[PDB]
Amino acid sequence: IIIATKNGKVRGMQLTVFGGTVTAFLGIPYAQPPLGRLRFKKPQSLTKWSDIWNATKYANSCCQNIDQSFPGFHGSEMWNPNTDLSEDCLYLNVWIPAPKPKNATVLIWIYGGGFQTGTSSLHVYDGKFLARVERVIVVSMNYRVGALGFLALPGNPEAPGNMGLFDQQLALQWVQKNIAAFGGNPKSVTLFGESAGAASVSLHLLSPGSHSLFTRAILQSGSFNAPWAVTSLYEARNRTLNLAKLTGCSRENETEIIKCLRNKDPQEILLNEAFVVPYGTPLSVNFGPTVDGDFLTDMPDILLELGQFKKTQILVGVNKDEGTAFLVYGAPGFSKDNNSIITRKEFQEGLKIFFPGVSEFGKESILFHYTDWVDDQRPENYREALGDVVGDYNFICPALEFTKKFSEWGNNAFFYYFEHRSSKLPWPEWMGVMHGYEIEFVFGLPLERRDQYTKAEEILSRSIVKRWANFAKYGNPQETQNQSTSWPVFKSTEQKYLTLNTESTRIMTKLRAQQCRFWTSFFPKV
């Protein structure tokens, strides 16, 4: 229960899971805390320690703004940090099976949160279930988000950008140098992550400095080519400058601006973070990944287009109702507390809220493609169209387009379509299979019979956990034993994908074909 790592000894605790035992090491540091002179700069390597580090409770989450749009509502506070915020937050967790394995496949979790929110300590990211049931090692890390994590004055190492991504990269390095001690195979490592986490995994596939730190990759409702995932260098400047005047730190020696930003208090930096976007949307990414010339050598859509990425297998997928969650954070006429029937005019105003800097014609073109009903009199028509608009634009079509382009360079790719709504889901029914609500199935939570998941859900989670582990171990997401529908590879020709649900696992072709031609060919032009 003590492990000797490159930098010192760490003590963990033993857990009782499913009449078995999993060893957890919660909150191992992987970098010098980025305080003081180090705020905004790349993570610096951790140097030796004395004693036995006591890795028995989750560490501090990184500084971030909390979602207080629904106080006391579990559906949204389940995503708020469940641990003290602090700039001193660069820590990671390890869950190894007991008895200690010998050469276990490592699964590495990167959480989402629009690059502004997130912590590895959330209940639905607990890795003990996967360690128990599939005997993989599970690793998750905290990385700097928002301005502390992605503030950029490009080239200037005082705030170069992509620091949070470099946090992640530094944890991957740590698994490379230390996981064998824990019983893990450094040579068999799968990144997986969700939303902004998944966009992070995709960018690790492009970033040469990560190519040797993992082998395979899983992307859950996310990819770098999503319209929210990369901040432009034009915008990155506009936004750190807007933070400078907002804290009365405007200068002209650009370095003296950063030094001034280093004497502000985290919450005063947290505070003015919100208003840097001229017109915000529920999908706004105030401070995000930039083309920094260090982590990202070029605009990523071009690296993808030109085959410049790690050649390996990918598992990619999205949920049926990605877009609904965001409607109740700004869309007029919407609420988690009713069925949110809106009218044609409320829909049009909702586009103004989701596509603010977009021409009158572009918004008219969105309405035209999504409002040609079978059925004019259906009252939910506009309500469902605006959910689909946001979901297809922000998640589904980019995940599909990433998967085509990646597979066109010869690697195996597997696409799923999660369409089960969780029986415990706290948001209303009209919101459907929401953004984020497959994580708990991936992580094995329905396997706890003691927490009110239907039996169908238990089996579904059990099959998903198997398929995910078989992808991690063997590059092939099959469940080979219980006579399950085979999961075909995704090719740019066929475009076969696998649906995931409790009734029927079907193989279908060309998800959202007509919707995605609009988004990824026509719409980028207006």
Ligand SMILES: *[C@@H]1O[C@H](CO[C@@H]2O[C@@H](C)[C@@H](O)[C@@H](O)[C@@H]2O)[C@@H](O[C@@H]2O[C@H](CO)[C@@H](O)[C@H](O)[C@H]2NC(C)=O)[C@H](O)[C@H]1NC(C)=O
């Ligand atoms: C569904 O609810 C929305 C919004 O919820 C209401 O907002 C509060 C102000 C209060 O009235 C609560 O009971 C609700 O939760 C309704 O949107 C409101 O609708 C009318 C006009 O459409 C008006 O009171 C407000 O302008 C709207 N809300 C705004 C501007 O935020 C909507 O009407 C409800 N629809 C159905 C079918 O129940």
Ligand SMILES: CCCCN[C@@H](Cc1c[nH]c2ccccc12)C(=O)NCCCC1CCCCCC1
């Ligand atoms: C000026 C406002 C900034 C909005 N910054 C987003 C962060 C974010 C979380 N995720 C994302 C995915 C893509 C792009 C951005 C984000 C924010 O806070 N949006 C509010 C809605 C958050 C939802 C609702 C709860 C459950 C569903 C998932 C998260």
Ligand SMILES: *[C@@H]1O[C@H](CO)[C@@H](O[C@@H]2O[C@H](CO)[C@@H](O)[C@H](O)[C@H]2NC(C)=O)[C@H](O)[C@H]1NC(C)=O
């Ligand atoms: C870039 O950010 C600048 C601030 O540096 C924004 O300028 C403001 O824009 C809004 C309206 O769009 C107003 O508050 C003011 O008219 C602008 N302020 C100043 C000082 O000019 C600007 O909007 C952003 N650039 C865009 C949107 O193209």
Ligand SMILES: *[C@@H]1O[C@H](CO[C@@H]2O[C@@H](C)[C@@H](O)[C@@H](O)[C@@H]2O)[C@@H](O)[C@H](O)[C@H]1NC(C)=O
């Ligand atoms: C680190 O942990 C040591 C071992 O803790 C022992 O076991 C745990 C489960 C508790 O029951 C604790 O009270 C036991 O002593 C401690 O002895 C030691 O003081 C700790 N040191 C630091 C610096 O945290």
Ligand SMILES: *[C@@H]1O[C@H](CO)[C@@H](O)[C@H](O)[C@H]1NC(C)=O
């Ligand atoms: C673990 O497996 C790798 C190949 O994936 C092998 O090279 C390595 O020597 C093994 N290490 C063990 C069994 O300790």
Ligand SMILES: *[C@@H]1O[C@H](CO)[C@@H](O)[C@H](O)[C@H]1NC(C)=O
């Ligand atoms: C101020 O800018 C100059 C170049 O414009 C640079 O040499 C100097 O380092 C900056 N100030 C500080 C304190 O570094």
Ligand SMILES: *[C@@H]1O[C@H](CO)[C@@H](O)[C@H](O)[C@H]1NC(C)=O
């Ligand atoms: C296969 O089926 C059995 C029940 O017959 C079930 O208990 C087991 O968990 C299933 N395995 C997987 C990997 O789904």
